[PDB]
Amino acid sequence: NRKCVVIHNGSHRTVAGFSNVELPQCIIPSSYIKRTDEGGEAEFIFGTYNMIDAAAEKRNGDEVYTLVDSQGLPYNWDALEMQWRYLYDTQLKVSPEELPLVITMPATNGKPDMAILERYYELAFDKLNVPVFQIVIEPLAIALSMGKSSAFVIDIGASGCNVTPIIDGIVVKNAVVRSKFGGDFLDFQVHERLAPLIKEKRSTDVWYEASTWIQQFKSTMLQVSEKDLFELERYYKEQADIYAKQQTGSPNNPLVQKKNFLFKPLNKTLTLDLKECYQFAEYLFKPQLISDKFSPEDGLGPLMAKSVKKAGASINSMKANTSSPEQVYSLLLTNVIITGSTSLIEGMEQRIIKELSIRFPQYKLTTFANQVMMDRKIQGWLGALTMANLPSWSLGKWYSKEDYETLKRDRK
Amino acid sequence: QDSILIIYPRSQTTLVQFGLNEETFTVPELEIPTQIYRTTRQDGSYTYHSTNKDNKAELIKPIQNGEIIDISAFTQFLRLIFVSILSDRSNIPLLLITHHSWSQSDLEIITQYVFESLEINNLIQLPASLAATYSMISLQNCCIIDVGTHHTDIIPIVDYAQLDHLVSSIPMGGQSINDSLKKLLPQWDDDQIESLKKSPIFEVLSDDAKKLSSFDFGDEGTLNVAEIITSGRNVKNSDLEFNTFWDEKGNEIKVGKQRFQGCNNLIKNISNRVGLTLDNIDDINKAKAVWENIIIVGGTTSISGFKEALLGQLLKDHLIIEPEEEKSKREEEAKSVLPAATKKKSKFMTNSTAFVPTIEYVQCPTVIKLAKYPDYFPEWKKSGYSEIIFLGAQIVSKQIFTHPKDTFYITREKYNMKGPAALWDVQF
DSSP states (O other): OOOOEEEEEOSSEEEEEETTSSSOSEEEESOEEEEEOSSSOEEEEOSHHHHHHHHHHTOTTEEEEOSBOTTSSBOOHHHHHHHHHHIIIIISOSOTTTSOEEEEEOOOSSSOOHHHHHHHHIIIIIISOOSOEEEEEHHHHHHHHTTOSSEEEEEEOSSOEEEEEEBTTBOOGGGOEEOSOSHHHHHHHHHHHHHHHHHOOHHHHHHHHHHTHHHHHHHHTOOOOSSOHHHHHHHHHHHHHHTSOOOOOOTTOGGGOEEEEEETTTTEEEEEEHHHHHHHHHHHHOGGGTOSSOOGGGSHHHHHHHHHHHHHHHGGGGTOSOOOHHHHHHHHHHSEEEESGGGGSTTHHHHHHHHHHHHSTTSOOOEEEOSOHHHHHTHHHHHHHHHHTSOOOOOOOOOOHHHHHHHHHHHO | OOOOEEEEEOSSEEEEEESOOSSSOOSOSEEEESOEEEEEOTTSOEEEESSOSTTOSEEEOOEETTEESOHHHHHHHHHHHHHHHHTTOOOOOEEEEEOTTOOHHHHHHHHHHHHHTTOOSEEEEEEHHHHHHHHSTTOOSEEEEEEOSSOEEEEEEETTEEOTTTOEEESOSHHHHHHHHHHHOTTSOHHHHHHHHTSTTOBOOOHHHHHSSSSOOOOOSOSSOOEEEEEOOOOOTTTOSSEEEEOTTSEEEEEOGGGGOSOHHHHHHHHHHHHHHHHTOSSHHHHHHHHHOEEEESGGGGSBTHHHHHHHHHHHHHOOOOOHHHHHHHHHHHHTTSOHHHHHHHSSSOOOSOSSOOOOBSSSOSOOOBOOOOSOOOOTTTTOHHHHHHHHHHHHHHHHHSOTTSOOSEEHHHHHHHGGGGGGGSOO
């Protein structure tokens, strides 16, 4: 009753802390280092620090593993137990069996896995033996914490883009869309494109780079163009041309402006022009530009529109309750919650707005994006904390004529 | 009134100030060792008291590295503080300065012991970092590097708030200087080394001070016992090769380059952890602000030339600035346009770190400064952590006395209503 323990296991971040404080106690990487020692014991190493210090040690026995798959679900449960025990014993400094526990599961189109729920119940009750235990749906908690019963949640994380429409507080499962192109993808592309400029055990090193200079490059150098990048190249080229023609940088062509990034490991300047920065994030919207599995329909825009129309068509399985598909559209598009760390790149929200408006003209677009960066990165955990402090209100069940009718049939 | 009991418990001492003044306001009146003697009864129940019974009672140090390792010992220590108060100089408000490492459990237990046992009506639990913050008005973003004996705390503060998830500590401090000096002087004993570390001639040299003269920094110092120049039964220290210092046994000892060595490891580690810590601040501008306001405190930091060296290391490691080779290339290439005899006279000049436009980057910090202290500190000791913490605590005190309309502390009423969990309704 006094406080809950709140834990969110993301594909990148793990956020933990008591429900009675707004700021989390811990934010650690979901990845961890497993170290087979010369002492004879297997040691687990959690935390951006500690993991970085260890990666610095360059011990051969060190291997970095992931705790959460690209689906947002835990795939390594012994390691998850180890992390939870780390958070409980050394950080929160409380016995698991003392307080309740609130965790996060991502929104899924199909009926929830009772396998991983059995895994959660086995972890929480059998091993750590927590007295009470609750699971919340991340984008749903996010919507509830903002008081939006109807919400269109675009969450751009490291795993990909997770799109979750919500109408009247229910998740609308069959309209849930997950993308393959997130912040990890960007990590890889940054490494690839910047590789030539750098060139002229391993896993801990790959990690280390992803958590240091790559991260800084993403948070500083990456930007999203307000519209299609090629069209914008054309536009800025022609506009640049026509304004000097009335007969050392150019103010009418922003795409050729030099931007400088200090690459610390080699202590050398990496110079790119604004176009080349735009390209990285542009891959999220036009994935076809990198390779082919990737249909243009795998881009953020088509996926968003797809989710919207899917939610629209799906809401009629309820018989529509009005006297409506276009109306649910308007409803989703008027409550758009943009969240996720990757969504903090400079031009994301405006580009998402553009992409939604060109595919839904004659609609009113209203988007909400938390301007507090730390908050946008941990929004789901914050929502979970909100739900954790809710009262245990015993709300009257609704009751359908069919709910009474099937019982009336089971009597006979 | 103001009769406020301010208690600031640390690993090795505890500062206590009884009552507030606001005219002829005072430094901590009482400084007592953080320790309590403990005996065991017939059934294993513990009896805590101030002084050892003859030779037989177990000395307990409740606080290690700022953490409370024994909560019961600590609470009893508080009780003995109130005893030790009323015995010299009856319901007084308690303002307890807390450490970041103290758990919610610890804090709740402290609250319950303060109310149900000590029976005082008003409790305030004030984070040290926030007290230190409030001491310096209108300082919103900063980073406290606090170097203790066995550990160093790194406490970033953004928008007047302690960032709990970024706050960390490293198991290095003043003692590590002793360790590395011991590695450099394996023949000396620990007391002579300690005396060297506390001697006037013990100082960290600037790269200016190193390059000018003497020795050559990159080994073992000497494989020879401490040189005793004298015993009983004026020019820059940097410039002399050998220098003198006095022992606690009354020995005049000569010493070489070792008086300039011992802090490199500590400051390097510190600089690393600081680097990662501030690197993980989410908002770029807040991080920039934090980098512009660095607070270096702790006893160890009073060593001559230490703060300047830590700042220097922070710049060396973390400052975002054009590589000297690139900048020189651009300078030479730019100077190519000058007539060969102007180029000629420009070659052996002291460079103006000029001519052509500096390269601007998309990262921070491009500026790393120690936070400048305000005018009203004088004076002892070195305007340290204790001083600013007590100043801030005093500011808070005044702030809550002059605002009767608001209750921003734990009251006996509210404790009776919500229990120890009443603590969390009043947070800084």
